[PDB]
Amino acid sequence: SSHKTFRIKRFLAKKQKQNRPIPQWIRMKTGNKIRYNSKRRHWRRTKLGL
Amino acid sequence: VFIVDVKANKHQIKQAVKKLYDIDVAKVNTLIRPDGEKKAYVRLAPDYDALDVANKIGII
Amino acid sequence: VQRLTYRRRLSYNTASNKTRLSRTPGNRIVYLYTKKVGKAPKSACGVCPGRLRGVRAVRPKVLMRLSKTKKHVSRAYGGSMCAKCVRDRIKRAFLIEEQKIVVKVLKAQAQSQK
RNA sequence: CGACUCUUAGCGGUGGAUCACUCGGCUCGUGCGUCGAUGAAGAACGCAGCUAGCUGCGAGAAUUAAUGUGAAUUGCAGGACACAUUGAUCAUCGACACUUCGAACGCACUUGCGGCCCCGGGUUCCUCCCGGGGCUACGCCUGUCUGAGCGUCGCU
RNA sequence: UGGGUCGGGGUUUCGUACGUAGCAGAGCAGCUCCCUCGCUGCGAUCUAUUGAAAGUCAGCCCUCGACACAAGGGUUUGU
RNA sequence: CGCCGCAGGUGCAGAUCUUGGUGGUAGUAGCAAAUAUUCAAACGAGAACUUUGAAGGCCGAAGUGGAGAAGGGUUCCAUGUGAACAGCAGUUGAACAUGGGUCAGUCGGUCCUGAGAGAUGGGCGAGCGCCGUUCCGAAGGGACGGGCGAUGGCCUCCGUUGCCCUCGGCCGAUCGAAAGGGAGUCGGGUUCAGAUCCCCGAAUCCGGAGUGGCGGAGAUGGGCGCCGCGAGGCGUCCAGUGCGGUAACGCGACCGAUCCCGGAGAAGCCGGCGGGAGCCCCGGGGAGAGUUCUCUUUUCUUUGUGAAGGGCAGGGCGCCCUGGAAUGGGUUCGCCCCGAGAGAGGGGCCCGUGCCUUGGAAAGCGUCGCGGUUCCGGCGGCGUCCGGUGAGCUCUCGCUGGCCCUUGAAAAUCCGGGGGAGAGGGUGUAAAUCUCGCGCCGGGCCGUACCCAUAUCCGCAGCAGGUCUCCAAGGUGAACAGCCUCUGGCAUGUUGGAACAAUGUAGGUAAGGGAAGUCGGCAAGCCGGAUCCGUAACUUCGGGAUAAGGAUUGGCUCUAAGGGCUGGGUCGGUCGCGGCCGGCGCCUAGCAGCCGACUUAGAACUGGUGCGGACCAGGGGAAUCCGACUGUUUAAUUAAAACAAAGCAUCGCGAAGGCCCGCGGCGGGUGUUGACGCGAUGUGAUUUCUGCCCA
RNA sequence: UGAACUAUGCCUGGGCAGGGCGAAGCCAGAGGAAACUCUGGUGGAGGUCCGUAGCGGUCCUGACGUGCAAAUCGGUCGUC
Ligand SMILES: [K+]
Ligand SMILES: [K+]
Ligand SMILES: [K+]
Ligand SMILES: [K+]
Ligand SMILES: [K+]
Ligand SMILES: [K+]
Ligand SMILES: [K+]
Ligand SMILES: [K+]
Ligand SMILES: [K+]
Ligand SMILES: [K+]
Ligand SMILES: [K+]
Ligand SMILES: [K+]
Ligand SMILES: [K+]
Ligand SMILES: [K+]
Ligand SMILES: [K+]
Ligand SMILES: [K+]
Ligand SMILES: [K+]
Ligand SMILES: [K+]
Ligand SMILES: [Mg+2]
Ligand SMILES: [Mg+2]
Ligand SMILES: [Mg+2]
Ligand SMILES: [Mg+2]
Ligand SMILES: [Mg+2]
Ligand SMILES: [Mg+2]
Ligand SMILES: [Mg+2]
Ligand SMILES: [Mg+2]
Ligand SMILES: [Mg+2]
Ligand SMILES: [Mg+2]
Ligand SMILES: [Mg+2]
Ligand SMILES: [Mg+2]
Ligand SMILES: [Mg+2]
Ligand SMILES: [Mg+2]
Ligand SMILES: [Mg+2]
Ligand SMILES: [Mg+2]
Ligand SMILES: [Mg+2]
Ligand SMILES: [Mg+2]
Ligand SMILES: [Mg+2]
Ligand SMILES: [Mg+2]
Ligand SMILES: [Mg+2]
Ligand SMILES: [Mg+2]
Ligand SMILES: [Mg+2]
Ligand SMILES: [Mg+2]
Ligand SMILES: [Mg+2]
Ligand SMILES: [Mg+2]
Ligand SMILES: [Mg+2]
Ligand SMILES: [Mg+2]
Ligand SMILES: [Mg+2]
Ligand SMILES: [Mg+2]
Ligand SMILES: [Mg+2]
Ligand SMILES: [Mg+2]
Ligand SMILES: [Mg+2]
Ligand SMILES: [Mg+2]
Ligand SMILES: [Mg+2]
Ligand SMILES: [Mg+2]
Ligand SMILES: [Mg+2]
Ligand SMILES: [Mg+2]
Ligand SMILES: [Mg+2]
Ligand SMILES: [Mg+2]
Ligand SMILES: [Mg+2]
Ligand SMILES: [Mg+2]
Ligand SMILES: [Mg+2]
Ligand SMILES: [Mg+2]
Ligand SMILES: [Mg+2]
Ligand SMILES: [Mg+2]
Ligand SMILES: [Mg+2]
Ligand SMILES: [Mg+2]
Ligand SMILES: [Mg+2]
Ligand SMILES: [Mg+2]
Ligand SMILES: [Mg+2]
Ligand SMILES: [Zn+2]
């Protein structure tokens, strides 16, 4: 909602920063074995815990 | 416009800008961004210009 | 007709959300959030229904910034008791005290016998 | 004549069996056998030039110091670095540091609000405002100070 | 020569169009040197023009009027 | 890997076996709830779906409109991409990628307490702990007051400090509401996305000021001796914590503590009236548009003044003074009021959201132009006017009633009064003190974007379901009904094209008969609004009842009735073509003029008898059974005759108690209770009865 | 571990067109010797009636029944 506590807003802030694509240079690293961010979350498919 | 520490209040922002930029400020407006960082709108005193201060700060 | 919206996040027709219609210099109708209707003091006697005269009817915390004159009447118990009950208490105090003198004199003249 | 259907074979798809491999487990054995109010375990939030996770770290934040080591780190860039008027990296780790919750400790929390003592500034000492620092939990032991009792007494 | 598309005629359905005119019209409102019984409006409706108006093959009938278009396309088939 | 030995988690077709993969079904079912799309153009490789324009429609203010709460959490906004996803497509997107965006003393949180939650004391408990919330506590750590002192120092003298005396029950920590209580921000402008937060301009609340910031108030007058022609001066003495009104009460302040009293906060639902505003409506004046085939001085749009002050209307008063009323009178829609003081006259107070004024026109808006600053809060001209109506709608304020075996919070917080401990100064250009005017300083922390739903929430999803609110135009009409429309919005609900077979789903019609159909009139059909008549049995007298039954209903042209405002004067007898007193006169069966809502009744004429023409909108009657009624019930097959109910009856109990909870505490609920009360049963309104049996 | 659905108590908020019938109370007129009665208005009661929103869910034993939906939709309905 519009009325939110600081903890809830701070919690939402962290979930927002970590929902980004992996940097491209990562695949160039030796022994990368990572293709894409498997922890991507869309607001409509899956809802946050809180 | 500055990005400040989330624990700093308006009084602390006012003193911080005053000493390390040698300017006088009129008021400080504060919000916390959706990314979690705190943003401060620091309005300078009328006798100070925000354009040359930004020029010597280096954010032109 | 131009329809209106609330200007605050309180969306319910509660007692603290009362509004009135105002026409701005910009020629538009807006809600103005009114203050609650204040009441004059009731008399300290508790026997007469009418509220006190000469005292402004405002909310209790507004009385802090009003001058003394606007909150009382220039008379004994003014701003706390109505004039009628003040007159009654003046008469009652005098008459009861006078009647105390009567019973005091009455025993004084009745004690003349051993 | 062709279509269609069936069987078989070649090739091609679909699919991921089989086989080979294994920085993982499972089991047994050995030596140690160490947490915490000096704030544990756990949790949260942050920290990289480019960095989401994992990992590491705590506003000194993908690390400081020290010691060993001895030329790297590396995906890209950058700049170091006489390797001796001392040194990349890695390891070790005894110095320093170590945000917020949490036994969690001023009171309270899906919020917020105090009190006391110092320091600095606006004051231009008197105490109002702002900032900084240190305290302010419960139980309990020894001692200390201040006390209570028509408890037991003594003297007047 | 053909078949179309319009038009026309026929058939048929409904029921008498708009406009204009009327000393038709329950009445009502203004003008009276006027008028010697009148004029100027409003007024549903009525009458005449007007069995009018409108539709009618899209799976109605006949055109020979008008217009353009029609020896064009593709795929196969042999005793 | 063979051979000799050794050892097994050692051999699969099944177990509706486990996991994974793949077929036929099958290019099939299907992509059919809520009326609807079409033309042209642009971009683009590509257009039924994107964008623009044009047209036709829909939502029709109880919206498919504009904004919020909860919930979501970046979905918000720009640019780009076009893999996947959006069950067709897409040049589009709530997709993907890259950037950006949420600004507060006065909007909330924060504070208060509510139902309640919950420590501590105490009690219990093997124990983690839990019982209990004033109960089995030495539960006040505060205070202007006074004293003893340290003089800490601008040691005059006031601020400090330690102790003592005196006073001191929120008698209970703490938590508990973004809808309750709760001081104080409004107008204009501005963005791609933020504004009551930014900018501009106007305010305002709270807190602070020791050395006291300025004014004003307190507060500055009399008596006597003298000087002085008088006016005016000197000395002494005495006052002085304001003043006015008969009153209601008024005035700018208007000394005062502990303590006490009171007020506000602080109160249900419903009815009927009245005031104010906003909207709607009507008549003009402008400005800009629309129509002009003919008519239309026409149709449409638009035509401002915030908060906060001051003044004035208006509304209210269970406020005061005079006076004393029956031949009772005033008065409302209703009421109701009066020798406990009517009517009448004169005052006082409260509210004042209305008007005028400062704000204010400089802003805003509408128009007509002119400059450019890639995209100026550009510059300029003109205007922003006068009126009238109302059972109209919506808010709000007020008055007066009704209902209750229902009586409809608390606390923070603020204020008035009573009392008078004290303090202040010696007649000064004075003191203590000040709720008066102005001036100076400060207001931290968190939230703030967007959606708020036939696509941003829950239902596995862009799911016909669910999800709390605010605003609310014109016509018709009884109406927030239904139907049409304006503002605003949308593209028909996850596809289109072509046809118009069966069967279906939804909706109509049907000659003659009229329930013969069927378990059964199921379904459908009939009726339906309003006016005027007219209404039975029965009845608990209230009802039944819109009983039943009948007539009328359009259009046009009239005719009557139902109101409100003003003015009713006999005259120069004279001068402030008008005014002071009067010789100078009889509307007194009331007239004269002006203005204005709807409603009702009657009549004529008229149409192919059609007229509540769409919409809206009871079929009726005679009986039997059950339940008295209203109410409730098996969410998802039973709405009933079942449950409940008022009424009736019975039973327990006087607190060391009845009933009940509890592992436990002399723990807890009823109980903030006390027999007209609690607790336990049965029966089930009213009426009338309720027989016999205690084996 | 759950009262985010539901059941019930409490606290604090919000909400419910337009009409019909016409209880008490009141006024006037009339008839009465009285007791009192009749008539016309006024008034606006009610777990009152028709009927919106809301709440509910009767019938079609309608639609749907690999649904829009693991209970929904249409009309008709109960209460308002
Ligand atoms: K007063
Ligand atoms: K004609
Ligand atoms: K004719
Ligand atoms: K609150
Ligand atoms: K009610
Ligand atoms: K006009
Ligand atoms: K202009
Ligand atoms: K006093
Ligand atoms: K919301
Ligand atoms: K077909
Ligand atoms: K039958
Ligand atoms: K009912
Ligand atoms: K039922
Ligand atoms: K008991
Ligand atoms: K019984
Ligand atoms: K027996
Ligand atoms: K017996
Ligand atoms: K009623
Ligand atoms: Mg903020
Ligand atoms: Mg509130
Ligand atoms: Mg105004
Ligand atoms: Mg193959
Ligand atoms: Mg090092
Ligand atoms: Mg709170
Ligand atoms: Mg002793
Ligand atoms: Mg023809
Ligand atoms: Mg086996
Ligand atoms: Mg097998
Ligand atoms: Mg098909
Ligand atoms: Mg289909
Ligand atoms: Mg419509
Ligand atoms: Mg909306
Ligand atoms: Mg968007
Ligand atoms: Mg698709
Ligand atoms: Mg995205
Ligand atoms: Mg106490
Ligand atoms: Mg609280
Ligand atoms: Mg916005
Ligand atoms: Mg004005
Ligand atoms: Mg009077
Ligand atoms: Mg102007
Ligand atoms: Mg006093
Ligand atoms: Mg918003
Ligand atoms: Mg839905
Ligand atoms: Mg969801
Ligand atoms: Mg779920
Ligand atoms: Mg359709
Ligand atoms: Mg479509
Ligand atoms: Mg949809
Ligand atoms: Mg028939
Ligand atoms: Mg027939
Ligand atoms: Mg039969
Ligand atoms: Mg039969
Ligand atoms: Mg039926
Ligand atoms: Mg009957
Ligand atoms: Mg007629
Ligand atoms: Mg029943
Ligand atoms: Mg009965
Ligand atoms: Mg039910
Ligand atoms: Mg059921
Ligand atoms: Mg049922
Ligand atoms: Mg009975
Ligand atoms: Mg009973
Ligand atoms: Mg709960
Ligand atoms: Mg609940
Ligand atoms: Mg009812
Ligand atoms: Mg009913
Ligand atoms: Mg249904
Ligand atoms: Mg069925
Ligand atoms: Zn009184």
Cα separation of C45 and C57, whole Å?
A: 19
DSSP state at residue A42? -
Cα separation of B51 and B29, whole Å?
A: 19
Cα separation of B31 and A6, whole Å?
A: 12
Cα separation of B55 and B48, whole Å?
A: 13
How was this structure obtained?
A: cryo-EM
Question: Which residue from B48, B10, B6 is spatially nearest to A10, judged by alpha carbons?
Answer: B6
3-state secondary structure of A27: helix
Computed on alpha carbons and rounded to an integer, the radius of gyration of chain A in Å comes to 15
3-state secondary structure of C110: helix
Instruction: Give C16: exposed, middle or buried? Use CB within 10 Å, 0-12, 13-18, 19+.
Output: exposed
Contact B3, B39 (CB under 8 A): yes
Computed on alpha carbons and rounded to an integer, the radius of gyration of chain C in Å comes to 27
Which residues crowd ion ligand 1, with CB under 5 Å? C 54
Tracing tokens 């006078």 back to the chain, one arrives at C98
B34–A16 C-beta distance less than 8 A: yes
Kindly provide the resolution of this structure in angstroms, with one decimal: 2.2
Contact C31, C22 (CB under 8 A): yes
Phi-psi region of C79 (alpha: psi -120 to 50; beta: other; left: phi over 0): left
Contact A28, A43 (CB under 8 A): no
Among chain B residues, CA nearest to A15:
B35
- Write the residue in B32, B33, B36 that is nearest to A14 by C-beta: B36
Strands of chain C (E only): list them. 19-23, 29-33
Find the helix or strand (DSSP H, E) in which C96 lies: helix C83-110
B35–A17 C-beta distance less than 8 A: yes
